[PDB]
Design a protein around this ligand. Structure first.
Ligand SMILES: O=P(O)(O)O[C@H]1O[C@H](CO)[C@@H](O)[C@H](O)[C@H]1F
Ligand SMILES: O=P(O)(O)O[C@H]1O[C@H](CO)[C@@H](O)[C@H](O)[C@H]1F
Ligand SMILES: O=P(O)(O)O[C@H]1O[C@H](CO)[C@@H](O)[C@H](O)[C@H]1F
Ligand SMILES: O=P(O)(O)O[C@H]1O[C@H](CO)[C@@H](O)[C@H](O)[C@H]1F
Ligand SMILES: *Cc1c(COP(=O)(O)O)cnc(C)c1O
Ligand SMILES: *Cc1c(COP(=O)(O)O)cnc(C)c1O
Lengths: 833, 833
């Protein structure tokens, strides 16, 4: 509708400078002219003009670290969920408004162009977005840090609903090019697979391996206004030229060339699984490929440091942990550990015992879940085929580890079979989480209950052996994408009262408590939320047609579709609402638009069945005339980072409904608290610290706490007891069973009825009473608007703890051994030396 | 050593302008700085700075044709052998010297950087290089012409000799990027495969096809100093997103994504075959893919022309031949013909008879060979699986064609089975050359004997039916790469006497005859050749170590290794030389370095065996002490366009030794005549017109003429008769048979002895006597240096006929119906309208 905001300055020389460079790239880069360029060409000409302001800083940030030679952080992760990069690069560079002006002054709309950029979807959900929020905070806090991963050609599938069913399609995100990466084929590295170990004379050598080459592509990562631009280096697999061709004595020339994309398949696609584990060979190859190439880049930069000069010299790998820290994001890069040992013992010739002290002191592991099927336990026959030397290192690590255990707990022979990194069973497997705790100096959970559960349940044997290792670092979100850029309106009215230093010191939001009774602030906070609701209701109407009423409670659950996340308990509530107004049509109920969005992993039949229940409820509710506009259900197609930047500011109610003790943290819950939505949720993961921060009175907690879940499981969850005692619940089960929601095919949901009734791992019926109760308490508050906005002002003013600048300042300090900083690096300026 | 030349002007503002843009791209494009850039970064910064001068001209040449709307030429070819693009773009743009200066003034050497560029090897030999010389001449003659083909990821294999054997390896030419193409993914098109024909109500429809998408990449093609920059558009195969993913009911998500490079395999690799024919499905798919996508681009530009406005209107495809001409380079794009019919009949709804008159008037075919196994005769079961509608069009074309034949030659029933486009036999096949003659309005050979042979032998039935169709257009070479850029020294001393207008009017070289007796010109011509010999002898010593004597006759044969090209007859001569000085060690013989280079198709066992004989002769000769430096044999590794630009200026003797009547033209023979080498050759292909142009006295013709070859075949070639009568020949056969040239393994060459003796298709022994005779006559002339240079001045001064500007001005005028031009298009300048 309008804006000016403090998206920086649009200064005279700079709007002019930009327009010129925009017209340059349209001509020289795009080789398009004004009468034939489309909005996409206009998008790339701006994308190149904005990366031009970034390269000078990138060049000097990288030479600056070469000169001062910090300890460098390597965040290894198999997922990095970046989303779009234009607006965020403008935010961090102070260019939002000058490019806005310049674009207006050239006849275009920035927002049109910004919507043309495709999302880099290299992540599934939470862990991958966490990696992306960390890179932002590591650059903003001036750390010499590098994100490393795989440059996947096809990120997470684009979801389409066809006839209410998920239909998945390839995310060919590079179809049109990527203006942000810089291929660096001169730095390609080999990564070896298969092979043998020959033991001769002095050590093992891994021989007759097949070679795949790792080609890197660097994406710049600019901090918020401090002239630090760090590097995300993503590897692409490339077939060699000789082996992937010469080995001869007939087998087709053309075939040998066509078979190269077989080795180049290691980076073809992101594995699409939220909280599960696929024991597939392609996957372990992707995991070894990023570990292998990354560790060669690490050692390379260490060998220069300044030791490649002196410092001491006589290759004292002794200082390797005082120059490198590698952060294992989950067990996906756990081969960082036998691979660092392999180079150090086999190739570099240190003794096992020096090389183990160097490995544990440089590695650290972040654990992201408790659910047992997410755990990676790779079968031994896979590792001995593919990586025979690393299996051999893992059996000697295992050996020496359990000799410490038995020395520490003598006679405790079941502990020994429980701590082992080798799981006997039909299929003997390697427990990768165990590897990680054994060869890392610090282990951490992503929220205070999650970290307490690890010590108390899942890794108690390991805590008793090395208590000092276990740590907690509650997750965070970046105030730059998740507030300044998806919600410029809410950021200006905060910046009007308290200024802008909160964008890199989010704890300042607390100074907003003073305005909880300021009627100018209550109306502005309330005007921003209604604005966002109108802009999203229009988006809905435009891009997807649907039309919803902007004057309802916008009830939204957006996250991957998993049973533990409980989209089914939300469904049970909307069917209740439906039925309470079918019995009393003429009772006023507060009207709500309830929006559920998220992706189902492709062969997870329950998740795909839950998307078909949600679109089935919307087919009834959205077409009943007695309901009118009072209730609508909307399934939010193709949830991804850029859609989250649209919906979360338009949210009034955030659904954070997991069975207590299953969500390790969640970070979507945080994004929704900085953007003026209220939380209804169980005491799970970080919802606990969030309510502790806003006060439980300012939060709508319901349900079973974890204690209660353990009592229910000692007792035995019988779901028939909830059916027998709750008539509103009896009735829903029977409407699902008789085809009410699937007329033409009545039995269609009996998979879901049989499950809820007989195999509910996540106790949906047990939290049902307390949850429709709690849901009556939020509707009661919504219809007294000024007391809703005051509860909202108490949530927003208490979001500070949940910034990734705090989480990363705590990894920096208590795990990596670096001090953060905000002192801006010298101004971008010229000087070619 | 030195140069200045007239490689254009290095003017004050321009050397400055260039240095600046070089430093810009190193920083902003390369994101490298001065202390860390390698010669490759320096190469790309210049490559981008030179394409910046090209885009303004390209943009305005393409909008200029949209405004005047010429008849446009489409040169469809499956091969385009471009070589490197930097120096040639500098030549044609007048930038050679300013960039030379600027680079010197920035501390680098241009020649170092220019050697870093990888050759675009999208061709096998002659036909592919012809396409590349034509594009240059079509732009220089200001024609609105477009080269169309496949953007192959892997061009022709890089050859390596290991132990004297060819070893082939992938040409991953895009490893480092290509600064010259511009991807245009917004213009992707579908190309359909497989399917069915349903006949309903009004016509056939091709239904249930699989879809592959064609992504184009445009390379600019600048004419020699006329501000026309035309377009080579090369298609890349891309899998669709929905079909290459959705078709469901289980078959793996990850698999569906990995299987996309199966459809993207259509442009993965160039088929590596010189003069043979592979009936492989991948190949017909590449042939349909370029026809399909090209014809959609053709029709698109025709539908705008100005008819998409009016001109008349009521879609009078009537004017389609007065606006389009498509040139079939060989039968590889022959499906241009049932595909143009298919769109016009099926999709566009014209009657068969209007659509056939429009097809023949727009298509024309260039025939490139006579050897029967080069002929494409695709088996019917392939075409009915893959392209069922086009087979159906080819059977109705066939039908109506033979009804004309039978009407014209009534009762002549064997003519009917000979002209048929459908070859009955065990495997019924379609004769694609026949398709081409039936649906083209003009057919041509590539040299006056080759064109006479078509009328007289291979297509006599077709000439008697439509005599008016057959034409000749002798091949040419471009004076810009093949003289101005590989031989700047020879071009300045010509330009010193006669000026520079000869570079686009090569017939002016005749004014050099006046200097055949000018002792200043004889010494300069002779100094340039000795310079080139020293620069190549150093190259040899550097890049490949070898060391040859620059004071010998440099005897060179460079071309693909085929039996008809007769590398074996040259080998028989060098073994003779060897043996004549083994019998008389102390006779002075004129010393020669004989260099044979060329690639063997991978499973052509004779060609691979001929490369092993040549490296085997060099192992003896090059290590005999009695020979001294008097004779050396050098196998020239990885012959390709950029190596041809090195060797051909260093050549004294050109070997053009094919059995008369087998080489259709040859164009290497021409390149060698403009660069001061003398030809020893048979009366074959264009060697006939070349000797007719220089006078037979100035040429060293030997051997059997085609008449004589027919008499020998009527009689019966018995090779034992030549063995019995020629002792020097008896002796070589026995040295090959007894392991003289393969000691450790004696029988190693008996494949080649058995062949020469019993299965010689190309009569090597019959031309042996006359050829060692003729070879004694060139050594006699070499040792009287001033009379060699005068014969050389008479060859160089008579090269004019062999320019592709003359060949293309004759296609323009007598086949396409366009007038050439040299009037430079307006100066590059700015103006964004
Ligand atoms: O991989 P390293 O060497 O750390 O970093 C690489 O990329 C940076 C960023 O442009 C260059 O400054 C550096 O010289 C290059 F080698
Ligand atoms: O990546 P997904 O599985 O969505 O998310 C996982 O990791 C994130 C980030 O630590 C946690 O918040 C979440 O509790 C867990 F389930
Ligand atoms: O394929 P056509 O349209 O002929 O040509 C295409 O590329 C040229 C060269 O930049 C543009 O001027 C033109 O507008 C575009 F559409
Ligand atoms: O492409 P290759 O097979 O080398 O060459 C073929 O076509 C060229 C170009 O017309 C002819 O000169 C040659 O005689 C023929 F054999
Ligand atoms: C933040 C984010 C997530 C995480 O959501 P949770 O509710 O914590 O599971 C998932 N997907 C996207 C697109 C995100 O923005
Ligand atoms: C000119 C050229 C050819 C053609 O040589 P011929 O002797 O005509 O067969 C083949 N390869 C390259 C690299 C060329 O330059």
């Amino acid at each position: 509708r309008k804006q000016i905001s403090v998206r920086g300055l649009a200064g005279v020389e700079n709007v002019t400078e930009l327009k010129k460079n925009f017209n340059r790239h349209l001509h020289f880069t795009l080789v398009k002219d004004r009468n034939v360029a489309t909005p996409r060409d206009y998008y790339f000409a701006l994308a190149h003009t904005v990366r031009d302001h970034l390269v000078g800083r990138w060049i000097r940030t990288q030479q600056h670290y070469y000169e001062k030679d910090p300890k460098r952080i390597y965040y290894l992760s198999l997922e990095f969920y970046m989303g779009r990069t234009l607006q965020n690069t403008m935010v961090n560079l102070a260019l939002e408004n000058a490019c806005d002006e310049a674009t207006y002054q050239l006849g275009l709309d920035m927002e049109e162009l910004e919507e043309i950029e495709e999302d880099a979807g290299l992540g599934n959900g939470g862990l991958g977005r966490l990696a992306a929020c960390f890179l932002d905070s590591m650059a903003t806090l001036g750390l010499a840090a590098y994100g490393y991963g795989i440059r996947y050609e096809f990120g997470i599938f684009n979801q389409k609903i066809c006839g209410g069913w998920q239909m998945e399609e390839a995310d060919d995100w590079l179809r049109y090019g990527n203006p942000w990466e810089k291929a660096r084929p001169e730095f390609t590295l080999p990564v070896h697979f298969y092979g043998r170990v020959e033991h001769t004379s002095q050590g093992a050598k891994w021989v007759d391996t097949q070679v795949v080459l790792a080609m890197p592509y660097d994406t710049p990562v600019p901090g918020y206004r401090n002239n630090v631009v760090n590097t995300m280096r993503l590897w692409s697999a490339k077939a060699p030229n000789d082996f992937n061709l010469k080995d001869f004595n007939v087998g087709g020339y053309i075939q040998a060339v066509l078979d190269r994309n077989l080795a180049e398949n290691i980076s073809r696609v992101l594995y699409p699984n939220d909280n599960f584990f696929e024991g597939k060979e392609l996957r372990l190859k992707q995991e070894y490929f990023v570990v292998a190439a990354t560790l060669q880049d690490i050692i390379r930069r260490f060998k220069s440091s300044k030791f490649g000069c002196r410092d001491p010299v006589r290759t004292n790998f002794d200082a390797f942990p005082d120059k490198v820290a590698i952060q294992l994001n989950d067990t996906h890069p756990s081969l960082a550990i036998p691979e660092l040992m392999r180079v150090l013992v086999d190739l570099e010739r240190l003794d096992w015992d020096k090389a183990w002290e160097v490995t544990v002191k440089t590695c650290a592991y972040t654990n992201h879940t408790v659910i047992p099927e997410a755990l990676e336990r790779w079968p031994v026959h896979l590792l001995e085929t593919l990586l025979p030397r690393h299996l051999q290192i893992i059996y000697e690590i295992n050996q020496r580890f359990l000799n410490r255990v038995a020395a520490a707990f003598p006679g405790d022979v079941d502990r020994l079979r429980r701590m082992s990194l080798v799981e006997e069973g039909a299929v003997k497997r390697i427990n990768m989480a165990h590897l990680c705790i054994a060869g890392s100096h610090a282990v951490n959970g992503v929220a205070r209950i999650h970290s307490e559960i690890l010590k108390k349940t899942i890794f108690k044997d390991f805590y008793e052996l090395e208590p000092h290792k276990f740590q907690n670092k509650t997750n965070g979100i970046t105030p730059r994408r998740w507030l300044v850029l998806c919600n410029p309106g809410l950021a200006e009215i905060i910046a009007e009262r308290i200024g802008e230093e909160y964008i890199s010191d989010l704890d300042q939001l607390r100074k907003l408590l003073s305005y909880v009774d300021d009627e100018a602030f209550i109306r502005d906070v309330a005007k921003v939320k209604q604005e966002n609701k109108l802009k999203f209701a229009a988006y809905l109407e435009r891009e997807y047609k649907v039309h919803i009423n902007p004057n309802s409670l916008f009830d939204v659950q957006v996250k991957r579709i998993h049973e533990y996340k409980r989209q089914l308990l939300n469904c049970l509530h909307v069917i209740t609402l439906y039925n309470r107004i079918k019995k009393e049509p003429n009772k006023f109920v507060v009207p709500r638009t309830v929006m559920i969005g998220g992706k189902a992993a492709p062969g997870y039949h329950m998740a795909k069945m839950i998307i078909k229940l949600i679109t089935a409820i919307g087919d009834v509710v959205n077409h009943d005339p007695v309901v009118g506009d009072r209730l609508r259900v909307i399934f939010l197609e193709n949830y991804r980072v850029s859609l989250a930047e649209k919906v979360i500011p338009a949210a009034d109610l955030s659904e954070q409904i997991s069975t207590a003790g299953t969500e390790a943290s969640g970070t979507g819950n945080m994004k929704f608290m900085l953007n003026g939505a209220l939380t209804i949720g169980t005491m799970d993961g970080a919802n606990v610290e969030m309510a502790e921060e806003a006060g439980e009175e300012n939060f709508f907690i319901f349900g079973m706490r974890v204690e209660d879940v353990d009592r229910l499981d000692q007792r035995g969850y019988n779901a028939q007891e909830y059916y027998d005692r709750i008539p509103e619940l009896r009735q829903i089960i029977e409407q699902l069973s008789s085809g009410f929601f699937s007329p033409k095919q009545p039995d269609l949901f009996k998979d879901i009825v049989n499950m809820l009734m007989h195999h509910d791992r996540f106790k949906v019926f047990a939290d049902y009473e307390e949850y429709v109760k709690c849901q009556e308490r939020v509707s009661a508050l919504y219809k007294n608007p000024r007391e809703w906005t005051r509860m909202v002002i108490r949530n927003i003013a208490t979001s500070g703890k949940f910034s990734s600048d705090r989480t990363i300042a705590q990894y920096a300090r208590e795990i990596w051994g670096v001090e953060p900083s905000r002192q801006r690096l010298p101004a971008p300026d010229e000087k070619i030396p």
